[PDB]
Each structure stands twice: as C-alpha cells, then as structure tokens.
Design a protein around this nucleic acid. Structure first.
Ligand SMILES: Cc1cn([C@H]2CC[C@@H](COP(=O)(O)OP(=O)(O)OP(=O)(O)O)O2)c(=O)[nH]c1=O
Ligand SMILES: [Mg+2]
Ligand SMILES: [Mg+2]
Ligand SMILES: [Mg+2]
Ligand SMILES: [Mg+2]
Lengths: 105, 692
DNA sequence: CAGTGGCACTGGCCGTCGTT
DNA sequence: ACGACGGCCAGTGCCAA
C-alpha cells in the first residue's frame, strides 16, 4: 500500500496528488530509518482512504531531498496540494505518528 | 671580531627605520647598545672593525642586516654604507653547513612543529625571537587595557625591543663559539675569534668560504628578483578558471550529489537488544519537542480545547541521523574513488593506510561499463591538472600572483644549503618547480618569467636573458668517481655526442627527458618496477634496462661497493663505520641510508660544483668590468641546481655571460682536479620558455 | 627500497567568535 | 544553547632538478 517514489515521478505522485501524502525520506544506512519503516507499513493500512504513505530513498533518488532542505533522516514530510503542510524529523513511535497524523489531517 | 644584530621597523622590502643595535667586541669583552639616535655611531663602529681588517658576525646578516643597514643608512642618514663581503660572517650560514642534516624554521617563516627531526637550540632561539617578543608585547598591552594591532610591536622602538636585541647577541655569540668548536671545519690550533678576516677564510675548511660567498651572491639574487609578467598570468588564470568551471559542470552532471552522516554525537543501539552498533552512523535524540505544545490554559490542560501544535520539527526521544548534502568534488580522491567503484571499478592497489590509490596511473587504467563515466575519467585527470596550475599560479598560498612585488618581480627565497647533499632549497614561492615548457600550460608559465619583462631604468628597453645549464652534470660526476675503476673510460665516452640522447636511443625511449629520469632513477637505486613505470612498461622491462646498463658500465657496481665498504661495517638497522661522505670542499655530508649513498655522493658533488660555479661566474663577470644589478649590466634572477638564468642589459652582455659561465665551469673542474671534463650549454632569449 | 626539495587539497579535529 | 571558520596536522600526489 506504500508508494515507492523516484525523482522523476515525485512531481505527479506527490505535488499533484490532490490528497494527503506522507513522504518519508530515508536511506538504507540509517538506524532510525530502519526503525520507523515497519511503523509506516501499519500506518499505510490504518489510514488507507484519508492518507497515502510514500517513501523516497535519498540514495537512489538524490535530486528531490535537496529542494526540501533535508538535514536529517528519516524526515517525514506531509504534503497536501503540492505543498509541505507539516514536517517531523525522527524515528517516531507508532503512537507519535498517529498523534501527528490525526492532528494534521 | 665583533658580534652584532639590529632591530628595525620591517622586513628588508619595506624597512625605513633602524630601532636599535647591539655590539659585542671580543677585544673589549663588552656589549654596547645603540638606540635609534645612535644609528650613526652604530655604523661607525661596524666600519671601524672593517678598517682594522676585522670581522663582523651576524645571524642571517647576509640576507637581512647587511642589506638593511645599507638601505637605512641611505634613507635615514643619506650615507653610503657597504660592508665588504669578506668581512662578514653569518652564523646561520655556518649552522646550515655544519648541521646540514638538520632543518630550521628559516628564521620563523616556518612552523617549528611541522619540521621533521631535531633543531639546534641556539638557532631555534634566534628564529623565535620575533614571535616571542610579539607575545611579550601583546601581553603587556592587554595588561594596560590598550588593544593590540596587526604588528604594532615593530612600529616604534622600546626597551623591551632593546633587551631582545641584547639577547640575540649573547645567543649569537654562544652559537658562534659552538660552531667554531667543530674541529672538522676549524683547526683547534687557532682562535678564530682573534684573527683578521684573511686568516679566517684561509685557515678554515674551504667549505666555510664557499658557503658565505654563495649566501652573499644569492642574497643579492633575491633582491634582484625575477621579472614577472603579471598580466599574462592573470589572463592564464581566467582561461584556467573557465576550463575548471566547465569541467566541474560536466562532472557534476555526470556524478550527482549525495547525503552523508555528519554531526551525530550519540551511539546507535539496537532497539531490542540494546547493544551498541558503532558501525551505524552516529545519531541525535532530541531532548525537547512533541506533537503538541504544553497546555497553557486550565481547561486546555484538562482536554477541553486541543493544545497548540508544536511547529518545532523534532520529538523528544525520537532518534534521527544528522546528515549533510555533499556535491561531487573532482579534487577529492575520496569522491573520485566512491563514484568509480559505484560504477563497477575494482581497485587493485591501495595505500599503506587502506585508501585506494587514485593517481594519474590508475585513472588511466580504470575501465567502467557506462561510456559517459568512462569519458568522465579524462575530465577528472584534466581537472586535477588544471588545479595544479591554478594553485601554483594564482590560488595557492604561495601562488605567483600573491608574490609579485611592486617592482614587478617575484623575489623567491633561497636556502643556499638547505638540502643534506649541499644543494639549495627554494621557496616562497619555489622557483625551482615552475612547470616545464613541455608540460601542459608550461610555455605560458615559463614565459611569464623573463628579462624581457624588465624595462631598463634609463632607456626603458627590455632586458635580455642568458640561461646556462651544466651538461649531464651528475653523470659526469659519476664518470669522475668511477675513473679509478675504469681509467676514465666513461669520462671519455660521455662526451661523444649527447649522453642522454645516446641513452634515449639505446633504451628505446620516446623523449630525451624520459632518458634522464630513467638513467638517474636507475643510477640511484630504482627497483625493477620503478624503472618500468618511468619508461612506461612493466617490471620485466625494468630488469632488462637494469642489467643492460649495469653490464655496459660495471664500474657502477664497483663504485657502489666501495662506498658501502667505507660507510657500512654491518647491517633496516645499520652499524656504521662512518656516517658521512667527504664533500668536494671538505665538508661532511650526512648519509641517511646505505642504499642512498651513491645519490649522496653524486648529488653533493654536483651541488658543490654548481655552487662554486655561480660564484666564480659572477666574479669573472665583475673582473671584466660588468656590474651586478638592475642599475648595471647583469642580474642573477634564478639558480635552479645546475642552471642559472641571468638578466642582461644587452645581447652583447648576454653573449659574454654565456661564454663566461663556460670558462667558470672549466675553472671549477680544474680547481678540484675533476676526472671528467665539465661543460655548460647556454641560450640567449627573452624569457625562461626560450632560455631553458 | 631513485634522492632532494616545496606545496596544494581534502578531511578529521579543536578552540575562537559570531548567530540562534 | 549552537554552528561557521581558521589554524594544525596527517595523507596523497605531483612540480622540478
Ligand atoms: C631530471 C632529473 C635530474 N636529477 C638530478 C641529476 C642531474 C641533475 C640536473 O638535472 P638536469 O635535468 O640538468 O640533468 P643533466 O644530466 O644535467 O641533463 P642536461 O644535460 O642538463 O639536459 O639533477 C635527478 O636525480 N633526477 C631527475 O629526474
Ligand atoms: Mg637579527
Ligand atoms: Mg643539466
Ligand atoms: Mg638543469
Ligand atoms: Mg618530500
């Protein structure tokens, strides 16, 4: 249920999605990134319908992150109508992601 | 004999005021201080010592004090002052001769901590006086509230300055007596602090005289400076910057940017096990921050009204990896290695530290599937080279453009006896490493240094250049030393046509230059593989050329063995019989390694020959009526080992400088009974591109 | 076991000094 | 409270003779 982004599809998949999109900028070499991954899988389901979860690997796709001033990973950017509505950096826990999501949606 | 030192307001280039001076006279055993208003008296005292046929000792007086006094006497007192060379002794010159195995801070220009080995104590002291005096000066100002500025410690004379001036002299006196105690250079039967100048030079080892004459001549060359074409170099800088920018653009398009961990402080630990994972990038666990802000109202604090969202960005306890965005830097061997391995390249050779070697050799041999990246390898090689040129010409700390002086010349510094072998070292900037004409951008670099760039002070006509280089110098030195084994056979063969071209052909090499780096690398101990690299082949080809040349002149082996027999009694930890070679002028020449002995013997021979050569050349010119200086007939601009570049007011003079240099070289050969005839090759032209 | 030199760049590290 | 920046210092390489 998670959308696996690429630099070339990021524009139409996210910036034109017309819905709530949670993008996760990660890397395979990051400890916190590996932590939150499982949590995003569960989230994708539970929030299916009112939120879409997308992941962008900054190694495979190095062109997107810079435009958003990424300084830490995992970075969670919640998009809505082509713009960043809210951003949170860190391996949040299941519950913390929920508070965050429910609050911004 | 007297020992002296002065304190002035600036370096030679812009000194305009004498602050003070101190003099220690051996005949009275007393120190005398001269303050700013005693300058006339100070100079009178130095001239009195000269009139008595005496001696004056300074520490770095050849390059600083003496010229400084001549200049200040003119500016301040409108007096002509010129201490004769034969009356001056320089403890720094002596120290560099006797302790040639050691390094020195070059009077504070070099950081002590960056130098290898030990440093002589007294000389170390003298070289630190300026920085040391500055610290005391600054400390006192901050003691009185006053602020410190740039280098105000030298603007005015003060008693603290005077005291240091006195210390330099007591320390210079001690250094002097320490050097005079070396029996190898100064006969014990003579008190050198109690003799006239003629006795001092005639009774001491020949090397003492040569070193002082070289330093005096070279001090003058520094002052002359090398006429430099600033305009041409700034235009080359523009062109090189453009090419750099273009290459960077293409390389960045090909190799994109990426993220790396950076700024992480804490250790990442397994969430379950809890065991540390040092290999995982360091992380950062924010201490403050949550999804909402702490409740501000009463009801809001009870769940009546939702709390304010925390715009922050972090959440306490939620770890993350700090990162930085990095853009490909073609100048980073690390970046190059990273991108190429990500393209399939499998490194073969690594450094003794673990990093893969990324030099021109490997880059040339790298092969990756993607054709665009394969081509990028060339852009990277060109880029590394473009930087080499930009760094040396414009951007480096010692860049030529940062060193051109107001007189339009670069006044490169020279340590006449900086190398163990007796060769000189060049720096600030190093005029002995200017790119050769046959290397990229070489003609442009080389042409920027030239007499043509100097317009005569009277007629305004450009000067001319005379470049003279000793012919196959170290190979002739080799012929000399093995003549006892082959009866001058090689000494005769060597002058049958050019020796390097003769070898070039016999070795089947592309250029004459290649023949030179080959023969010398071979002669000095290069291994089979090193010989291969030099000739662009493998270890196999190395062994061939090795046995071919070693078989052609077996005297090489005989000479190498005799040297060993003389230096080594057992042997890498070595047990030495004697750890020095006796140089042509008698000096001891430290041998760092048994294997390098042959190089010590020949490089030294060539260095002393050339040193006596430039000295004798200038002397012969002067005795022919020519005057040394921009206000005269000729001017030494540079000395690069076995080569001199001289500016001449006219072609006629250039022709005489070239012929005189040849007469001088043959004189040097006869002077030391050399078993191989010595020669020089001269060229007349506008700049260094044509004169070398 | 080339030897003899100078010096430019990158990247790790740390105490200074302006910014959040 | 934090982070840009300039010396220091090894590593690495290349310039010349
Ligand atoms: C280039 C080079 C030189 N040397 C030493 C030994 C020689 C001297 C002088 O060099 P030069 O090129 O004049 O050589 P020279 O024999 O004088 O050739 P010319 O007749 O000047 O061309 O420097 C060395 O050890 N390794 C090298 O790679
Ligand atoms: Mg002094
Ligand atoms: Mg030569
Ligand atoms: Mg030469
Ligand atoms: Mg070196």
């Amino acid at each position: 249920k998670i959308i696996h982004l690429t630099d070339d599809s990021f524009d139409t998949d996210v910036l034109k999605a017309d819905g709530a999109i949670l993008v996760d900028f990660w890397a395979e070499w990051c400890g916190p990134c590996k932590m939150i991954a499982p949590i995003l899988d569960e989230i994708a389901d539970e929030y299916q319908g009112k939120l879409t979860v997308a992941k962008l690997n900054i190694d495979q796709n190095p062109g997107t992150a810079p435009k958003y001033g990424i300084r830490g990973i995992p970075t969670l950017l919640l998009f809505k109508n082509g713009e960043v509505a809210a951003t949170k950096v860190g391996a949040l826990s299941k519950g913390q992601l929920k508070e965050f999501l429910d609050a911004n949606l | 004999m007297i020992v002296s030192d002065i304190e002035a307001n600036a370096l030679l280039e812009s000194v305009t005021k004498f602050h003070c001076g101190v003099i220690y006279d051996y005949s009275t055993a007393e120190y005398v201080s001269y303050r700013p208003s005693d300058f006339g008296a100070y100079l009178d005292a130095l001239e009195a010592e000269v009139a008595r046929g005496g001696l004056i000792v300074f520490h770095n007086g050849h390059k600083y004090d003496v010229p400084a006094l001549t200049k200040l006497a003119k500016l301040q007192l409108n007096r002509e002052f010129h201490l004769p060379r034969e009356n001056c002794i320089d403890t720094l010159v002596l120290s560099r001769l006797i302790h040639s195995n050691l390094k020195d801070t070059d009077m504070g220009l070099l950081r002590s901590g960056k130098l290898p080995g030990a440093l002589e104590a007294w000389g170390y002291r003298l070289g630190e006086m300026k920085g040391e005096y500055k610290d005391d000066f600054k400390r006192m100002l901050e003691e009185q509230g006053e602020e410190y500025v740039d280098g105000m410690e030298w603007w005015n004379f003060n008693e603290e300055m005077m005291d240091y001036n006195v210390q330099d002299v007591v320390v210079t006196k001690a250094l002097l007596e320490k050097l005079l105690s070396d029996k190898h250079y100064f006969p014990p039967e003579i008190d050198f602090t109690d003799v006239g100048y003629t006795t001092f030079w005639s009774e001491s080892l020949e090397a003492v005289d040569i070193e002082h004459r070289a330093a005096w001549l070279l001090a003058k060359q520094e002052r002359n400076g090398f006429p430099f074409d600033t305009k041409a170099i700034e235009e080359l800088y523009v062109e090189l910057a453009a090419r750099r920018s273009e290459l960077l653009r293409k390389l960045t398009e090909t190799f994109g940017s990426w993220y790396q961990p950076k700024g992480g402080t804490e250790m990442f630990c397994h969430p379950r096990t809890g065991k540390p994972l040092p290999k995982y990038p360091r992380i950062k666990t924010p201490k403050v921050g949550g999804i909402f802000k702490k409740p501000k109202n009463k009801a809001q604090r009870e769940g009546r009204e939702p709390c304010e969202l925390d715009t922050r960005e972090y959440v306490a306890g939620a770890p993350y990896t700090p990162v930085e965005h990095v853009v490909f830097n073609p100048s980073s061997r690390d970046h190059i290695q990273k991108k190429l391995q990500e393209a399939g390249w499998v490194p073969t050779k690594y450094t003794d530290k673990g990093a893969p070697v990324v030099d021109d050799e490997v880059l040339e041999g790298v092969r990756v599937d993607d054709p665009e990246k394969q081509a990028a390898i060339d852009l990277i090689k060109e880029y590394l080279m473009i930087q080499k040129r930009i760094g040396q010409s414009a951007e480096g700390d010692k860049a030529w453009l940062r060193y051109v002086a107001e007189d339009g010349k670069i006044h490169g510094s020279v340590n006449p006896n900086g190398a163990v072998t007796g060769r000189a070292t060049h720096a600030f900037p190093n005029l002995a490493q200017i790119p050769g004409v046959r290397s990229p951008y070489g003609e442009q670099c080389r042409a920027a240094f030239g007499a043509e760039h100097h317009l005569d002070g009277i007629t305004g006509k450009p000067w001319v250049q005379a470049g003279i280089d000793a012919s196959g110098l170290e190979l002739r030195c080799l012929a000399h030393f093995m003549a006892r084994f082959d009866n001058g056979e090689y000494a005769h063969e060597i002058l049958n046509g050019d020796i390097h071209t003769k070898n070039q052909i016999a070795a089947e090499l592309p250029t004459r230059d290649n023949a030179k780096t080959f023969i010398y690398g071979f002669l000095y101990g290069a291994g089979d593989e090193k010989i291969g690299q030099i000739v662009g082949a493998g270890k196999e080809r190395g062994k061939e050329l090795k046995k071919k040349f070693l078989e052609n002149t077996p005297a090489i082996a005989a000479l190498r063995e005799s040297i060993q027999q003389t230096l080594v009694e057992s042997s890498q930890q070595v047990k030495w019989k004697r750890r020095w070679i006796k140089g042509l002028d008698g000096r001891k020449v430290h041998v760092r390694s048994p294997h390098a002995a042959l190089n010590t013997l020949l490089q030294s021979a060539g260095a002393l020959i050339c040193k006596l050569w430039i000295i004798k050349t200038e002397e012969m010119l002067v005795e022919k009526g020519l005057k040394h200086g921009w206000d005269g007939d000729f001017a030494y601009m540079a000395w690069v080992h076995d080569e001199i570049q001289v500016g001449c007011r006219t072609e006629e003079i250039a022709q005489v400088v070239i012929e005189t240099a040849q007469e001088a070289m043959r004189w040097v050969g006869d002077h030391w009974n050399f078993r191989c005839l010595l020669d020089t090759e001269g060229k007349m032209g506008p700049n260094w591109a044509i004169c070398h």
